[PDB]
Structures are given as C-alpha cells and as structure tokens.
Amino acid sequence: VGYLQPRTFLLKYNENGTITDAVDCALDPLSETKCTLKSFTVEKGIYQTS
Amino acid sequence: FELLHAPATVCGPKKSTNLVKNKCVNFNFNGLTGTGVLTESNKKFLPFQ
C-alpha cells in the first residue's frame, strides 16, 4: 500500500509512444539538473538549480 | 429533469455528416475544432488514447 505524492517527473517517449523511463526531480541534485535542461545527458560545467 | 452537482450521465445524441478527407475544410473531433487536410498516416497510437 503506497500513497502518491505531487512530485515532478520527466517521461521518456521512444518511437513506440510508450513510457520507458522516468526520472524524479526531487531526490538528488544530479537528477534535478536534467529537469531544466530537458535531457538525460549532462556534460561538464556548472549549472543552476533553484 | 433534476440537475444537481453530480456528473450527468443522460445527455442527447449528436447527429452530423460523414467523413470527408483529402480536402482543406473545417473539421471537429471530440471538441477539437481544426481546419486542414485530413490526410492518412502510417503511425499507430495507443488503444486507450
């Protein structure tokens, strides 16, 4: 039994149109960077958060 | 005819023309009113969307 919480997720749609991967933007600082850049490949450098 | 805050389940039938494609005319599908050519495609969606 689990309760859903209003978080932030970035769904990944492939060529079939189904959800294959989901990354939560409220857990680790590394996952929060992919929320603004809208990409799962973060290169080197300094970025912002909030 | 009682109308309260509950969601209504008894509405009325909607009667309209058939389907005319290959023309740049106005169309309407489930409220989405657009204007363009209803050309065919090869992709497929999902059986619940």
Residues 6+ apart with CB under 8 A from B25: B35
Residue of chain A nearest B43, judged by CA positions:
A16
Q: Are the beta carbons of A40 and A23 closer than 8 angstroms? A: yes
Structure determined via: cryo-EM
Q: Is A15 on the interface with B (CB under 8 A)?
A: no
Q: Token pair 């969307």 is at which residue?
A: B49
Q: Is A17 on the interface with B (CB under 8 A)?
A: yes
Q: Are the beta carbons of A29 and A47 closer than 8 angstroms? A: no
Q: Which chain B residues have a beta carbon less than 8 Å from that of A17?
A: 45-46
Resolution to 1 decimal, in Å?
4.3
Helix (H, G, I), strand (E, B) or coil at A13: strand
Give the distance from residue A17's alpha carbon to the nearest chain B alpha carbon, in angstroms.
7
- CA-nearest of A25, A22, A13, A15 to A50 is A25
For residues B29 and B16, give the distance between their C-alpha atoms in angstroms, rounded to a whole number. 11
